[PDB]
Amino acid sequence: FRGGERVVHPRFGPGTVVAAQGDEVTVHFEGFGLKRLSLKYAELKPA
């Protein structure tokens, strides 16, 4: 991801990709705030 992308997370819901360094993706979610996630396991879908 390049940053700005809309994604959906199975538990955190709609969020926006903030950063991406390798397998780590930082996503900002409406309900939960900033999350530092692993791409292998986040199960992110594009919105």
């Binding site: 538990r11 955190f12 360094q21 390798g22 530092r36 996630l37 396991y41 199960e43």
Partner: protein, 409 residues
């Protein structure tokens, strides 16, 4: 539920909630999770339930070899049918090579070494390639350098009974896997051939294998006791894994050429500076090392030349145990408040030691490339980290997305 078979006590009280909280965090993809407050048996019970729930191989680091041994023992009880490996290194027990200039004192690497250390290390990498149900418990020395696992994987040797395999080829492929020939003392990583009988002691094994040959045909295979020769089992066949972790697809003579090239550049550097003593120190030590290599395929302190056996470039981070796991492993850092600072300062402390050795001619500059990972290099090789502590330190609390409590006093 299929990978690991947990046979231990059931969690009581709120401990089921702490297990679920960790499993929720990890399945969410949280990159940094903290288990806070766990102690004693309940600590490893929770880790074990989490490991079973996720079905992935697991790496567990402890502040020191003693606590790693305690954790491994607990895990061996909780998973009696799974591979619980114990990974330690020379540096857990012995003093490294060092030179203190203020006192003109050279401290040599300890030559009288326990063979159990290399046996455990080899048992670990063997398990990590041959099965998924592995939990490796290690000191922070897991993140010191190791050889190319692509070559460790590819350079195996399959023997079946009732098939050849002619003799003179088997001895060639044994030397290709790093096995020394010693007919006097058969210890792990060595082999012996008298007549049509071949005794192979795998580097990971507690009991060598007896191969009996009738012409080319493998007549009989038996696993034998080390001290008494008693036959303990017959074997249909076996897969032999290498006897060093430093294995290259380039030839040994070619490697030794690359190394000598650096040696003479560095001598040119010292000589141009008038530092004759450093140059002759460096020649004596390096050439002696390469000569032990050329004749036996290995030498003490071969890891100093690790860059040349792995094809890494200067400054590039080396291979570590991390590269021997399948892609989806899981990391726990026990005693997080101690183990994270250790991880953070491995590089600077190791660098300090080797730079003195390099400045005064004890080692080539390439030796600096056999080094522990930098902490951010570590964090890039792992997907998810679970910090375990009852007093988690600043990094854990600053970076965790989830902090799950388990206070059982």
């Amino acid at each position: 539920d299929m990978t690991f078979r947990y046979r231990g006590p059931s969690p009581k009280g709120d401990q089921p909630k702490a297990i679920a909280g960790l499993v929720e965090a990890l399945r969410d993809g949280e990159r940094f999770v903290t288990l806070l407050g766990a102690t004693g048996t309940g600590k490893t019970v929770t880790m074990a339930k989490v490991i079973e729930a996720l079905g992935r191989p697991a790496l567990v680091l402890a502040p020191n070899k003693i606590l790693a041994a305690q954790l491994a023992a607990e895990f061996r009880e909780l998973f009696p049918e799974n591979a619980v490996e114990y990974f330690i290194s020379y540096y857990d027990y012995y003093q490294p090579e060092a030179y203190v200039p203020g006192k003109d004192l050279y401290i040599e690497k300890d030559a009288s070494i326990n063979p159990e250390i290399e046996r455990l290390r080899h048992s670990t990498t063997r398990s990590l390639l041959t099965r998924r149900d592995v939990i490796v418990v290690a000191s922070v020395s897991a993140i010191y350098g190791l050889g190319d696992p692509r070559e460790y994987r590819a350079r195996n040797l399959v023997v079946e009974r009732g098939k050849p395999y002619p003799r003179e080829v088997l001895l060639e492929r044994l030397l290709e896997l790093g096995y020394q020939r010693n007919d006097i003392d058969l210890s792990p990583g060595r082999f012996r051939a008298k007549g049509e009988v071949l005794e192979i002691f795998p580097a990971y094994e507690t009991e060598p294998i007896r191969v009996e040959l009738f012409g080319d045909e493998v007549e009989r295979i038996s696993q034998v006791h080390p001290v008494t020769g008693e036959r303990l089992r017959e074997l249909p066949g076996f897969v032999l894994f290498p006897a060093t972790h430093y294995l290259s697809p380039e030839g040994l003579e070619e490697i030794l050429k690359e190394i000598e090239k650096e040696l003479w550049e560095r001598v040119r550097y010292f000589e141009e500076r008038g530092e004759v003593l450093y140059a002759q120190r460096l020649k004596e030590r390096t050439l002696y090392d390469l000569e032990m290599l050329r004749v036996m395929g290995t030498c003490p302190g071969v890891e100093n030349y690790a860059r040349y056996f792995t094809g890494k470039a200067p400054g590039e981070p080396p291979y570590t145990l991390l590269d021997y796991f399948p892609e989806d492993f899981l990391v726990f850092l026990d005693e997080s408040h101690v183990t994270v600072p250790q991880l953070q300062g491995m590089y600077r402390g190791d660098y300090a030691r080797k730079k003195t050795l390099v400045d005064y001619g004890f080692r080539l500059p390439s030796a600096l490339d056999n080094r522990p990972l930098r902490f951010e290099e570590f964090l890039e090789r792992v997907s998810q980290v679970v910090f375990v502590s009852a007093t988690p330190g600043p990094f854990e609390l600053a970076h965790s997305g989830r902090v799950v409590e388990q206070i059982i006093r």
